């Protein structure tokens, strides 16, 4: 009823090639609750016991404690930098950060392996192929008929359950191994049957054989699916996270790294941003996003004057490509006044903040609330600009910023600059090849650009995993005007 009302009043207004994923914990923190919502689709509702493998492993408290310890040490490396700066202390500094990168990598790997397991396909953005799914249904039902003691009335599985198998990915690729994932999903199927009154004992089921036959069915699905590949769906995922789950870099889970994923405080917030989308100046999936003109942006570069490498990296590029030809406002090597900051938020389609922190030292959060409307899509390239709910990102979302890019923890200048440069190139703010005068530009959504830009960092986990975007997909409108 409430899921019915949520579907009708919120989700069915969301672009149909996007989906919304809600992540929360059960009372004791024993289960990960995942709800996938999509316009015109029945909801996926999952409750995943984190320790389910044991009775067939680390609990939430253990995982979160490990994460927070890693983050604490990462933050320490970002500021002990100045003191350590020498010539052989360099080696130790880089070694420490490499070790932390590996630690965080392994934590995310373990979360994906143990907590998500075979349900990682719930995050899949693959397009629905109704005719192929029913072919898979017939084969899979054949597997159940052959192997379940209960079939020596039959429960009929929902299509969304079958889509979890498809969502594991291309089973025909070299290196593909779905055995553990498939085992996890076969337990799920047996448990669904059990729930609806078709009962079986695990011990009487040859799961290993079902895995082989199910994998063979998936190879048949994907062989045929690959003959008509998905060209460009502009699929996007929006995460709604419960309070304890924001600190996790979900987007950097191995199975999510390639996907365009953003976060949103609430469904109410998502709905508001969608109703305020600007159309491009131009059956076109890009039309689902907000379109921000390239003209008239603002960049705030090295406002505290001490970030000389960051200034050096971008100042000439910004003068050449933004200030000179596209009427951008520039604030360089001086602090912006609060009126300047508020004016940029009000008038600029894009605001680039390349400085320390979130910029809260220059503009009060409550004045971001007083704004009749926040026009700007905002990139907060500084330490913990989206971290630790209440915070700067919260207020930009309240103000109606279409999107805000920020960091979950502290970062260092050159590596976040590599990321930022990648975002601007992918998004089309700067021409391709600028960071490596250029002309010709990409047109990824901001969310797609952020996901791709994580590749640019020396540390995918220590640096890039910090980077997240709150809001909806934003496209640059190159020839557009406000």
């Amino acid at each position: 009823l409430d899921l019915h009302r949520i579907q009708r009043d919120y989700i069915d207004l969301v672009p149909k090639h996007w989906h919304v994923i809600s992540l929360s914990l059960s009372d004791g923190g024993h289960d990960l609750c995942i709800t996938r919502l999509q316009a015109g689709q029945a909801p996926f509702v999952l409750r995943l016991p984190l320790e389910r493998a044991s009775s067939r492993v680390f609990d939430f408290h253990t995982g979160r404690a490990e994460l927070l310890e890693i983050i604490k040490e990462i933050n320490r490396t970002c500021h002990d930098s100045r003191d350590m700066a020498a010539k052989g202390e360099r080696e130790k500094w880089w070694a420490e950060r490499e070790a932390l990168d590996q630690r965080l990598k392994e934590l995310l790997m373990n979360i994906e392996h143990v907590w998500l397991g075979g349900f990682r396909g719930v995050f899949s953005q693959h397009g629905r192929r109704p005719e192929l799914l029913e072919k898979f249904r017939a084969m899979f039902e054949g597997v159940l008929d052959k192997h379940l003691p209960s079939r020596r009335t039959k429960v009929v599985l929902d299509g969304n359950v079958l889509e979890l198998f498809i969502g594991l990915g291309d089973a025909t690729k070299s290196g593909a191994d779905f055995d553990e994932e498939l085992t996890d999903l076969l337990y799920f199927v047996v448990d669904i049957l059990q729930f609806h009154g078709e009962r079986n004992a695990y011990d009487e089921i040859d799961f290993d054989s079902m895995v082989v036959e199910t994998m063979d069915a998936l190879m048949a699905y994907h062989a045929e699916a690959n003959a008509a590949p998905e060209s460009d769906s502009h699929a996007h995922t929006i995460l709604v996270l419960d309070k304890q789950l924001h600190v996790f870099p979900w987007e950097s889970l191995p199975c999510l790294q390639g996907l365009a994923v953003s976060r949103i405080p609430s469904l109410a917030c998502l709905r508001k941003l969608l109703l305020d989308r600007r159309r491009s100046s131009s059956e076109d999936p890009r039309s689902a996003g907000h379109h921000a003109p390239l003209s008239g942006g603002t960049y705030i570069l090295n406002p505290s004057s001490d970030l000389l490498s960051t200034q050096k990296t971008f100042e000439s590029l910004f003068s050449t490509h933004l200030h000179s030809p596209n009427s951008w406002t520039r604030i360089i090597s001086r602090p912006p006044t609060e009126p300047e900051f508020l004016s940029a938020l009000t008038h600029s389609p894009i605001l680039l903040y390349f400085g320390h922190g979130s910029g809260a030292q220059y503009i009060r959060s409550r004045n971001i609330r007083h704004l009749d409307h926040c026009r700007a899509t905002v990139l907060l390239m500084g330490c913990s600009s989206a971290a630790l709910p209440s915070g700067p990102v919260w207020n930009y979302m309240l103000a109606g910023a279409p999107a805000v890019v920020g960091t979950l923890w502290d970062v260092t200048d050159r590596d976040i600059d590599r990321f930022a440069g990648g975002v601007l190139e992918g998004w089309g703010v700067l021409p391709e090849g600028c960071m490596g005068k250029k002309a010709g530009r990409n047109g990824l959504s901001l969310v797609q650009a952020v996901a791709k830009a994580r590749d640019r960092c020396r540390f995918r986990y220590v640096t890039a995993a910090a980077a997240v975007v709150y809001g909806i997909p934003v496209y640059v409108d190159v020839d557009g005007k406000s």
Binding site: A85, D410, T412
Partner: peptide, 8 residues
Amino acid sequence: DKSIEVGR
């Protein structure tokens, strides 16, 4: 031997 990076 790359210079230590400066904090955000």
